[PDB]
Amino acid sequence: KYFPIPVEHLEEEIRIRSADDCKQFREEFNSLPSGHIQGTFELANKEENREKNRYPNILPNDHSRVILSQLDGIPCSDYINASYIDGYKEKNKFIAAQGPKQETVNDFWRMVWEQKSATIVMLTNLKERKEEKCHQYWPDQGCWTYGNIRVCVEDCVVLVDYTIRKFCIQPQKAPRLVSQLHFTSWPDFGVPFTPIGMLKFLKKVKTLNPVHAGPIVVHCSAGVGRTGTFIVIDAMMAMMHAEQKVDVFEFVSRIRNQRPQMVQTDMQYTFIYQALLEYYLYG
Incomplete structure (x- = not known):
């Protein structure tokens, strides 16, 4: 049984749950x-x-x-392989x-047009581990027509940890x-070395998403792992x-009742806690 953690105990609880090669964190994730x-x-x-599905067992x-x-x-x-996901006290904040x-x-x-989304969060590179993780769905210059949507x-704007592209x-x-x-610095193996870059990226998404827009579209390759990590840190x-x-x-x-298997590994689960501690101490 897992109770909420008051912020004044967060640093100590992370120490406790990280001890013995994250023994308690691994138990928590597996529960x-x-x-x-x-x-x-x-x-x-x-x-x-x-x-229309990338992986047969990762379905909305x-x-x-x-x-x-x-x-x-x-x-x-x-049909599209995509699910609405709640935010903190905000129904269907994300897709x-x-x-x-x-x-x-x-x-x-x-989906982007009909949902009135104004922000897309991409958490994968197009290729990782020499494998195609995402098809490039945008033009590098000029215009392209996808079905009926030009x-x-x-x-x-290319920055060291992420790229911002704007489309009409x-x-x-x-x-x-x-x-x-587009978060470009997630490693091909494991999670980021510190959560500092992801926290900066999260703040940038919040800054740029307009106030009256549809849900923020968040995607990786399967749309559960890095996608879930991002959403949970935000919430x-x-x-x-x-x-x-x-x-x-x-x-x-809660959000796994909207889309199964959000947050894919215990390493991503611990990364969530590490990002929250960094935000509490220095954010």
Whole structure:
């Protein structure tokens, strides 16, 4: 049983749970529900949708999946591997999405347009470990038309830890500016060496996301691991600021009822706590 942690005990609790090669942290992570028990997965498992999933066992459940408009003449075209995810006291603050495949890039931009999202958070490089993790869904210069959505690149700023790209998007009536915040420094193996860069990135996402926009689209490759780590840190920072407490175990449990297996490894789970401690001490 895991109780909330008051911030004045957070540094000590991290020491305690990190002792013995993170013995208690590993036990805590292994006690989480998976999220597979209560939900249903009929739509993700339809034969027509098999090619739209990157990994057969990483699926949205039916109740929190993002529903796309139906394309005329195309059965089952309402599906995308993406789920709404709650924030701290904010229903459906996020969409956790798999990184698009070549065959789902058009669906991905349909989701961004229809959900009125203004911010995309990309937590993967296109290639990692020599494998394709995400298909490039944006033009490097000029414009490209994905289905009915024309995407034009307006700006690109490369920084040491992340890149910010800005796109003007419009169906082919008023165009919309979409900011892509691309975290480029996550290692191919393990988690970042310190949480300082991720915390700076999280603050930048919060600064750039407009106040009246749709959900922030957050994606990695499968859309559960790094995606979950990002969302949970964001929600627990808000909880810390409002309540002077954090309850990571409860929140991960909660969002796994929206999308199974959010936060994929115990190393990512401990990274969450390390980021929250750094924010409490110095943020």
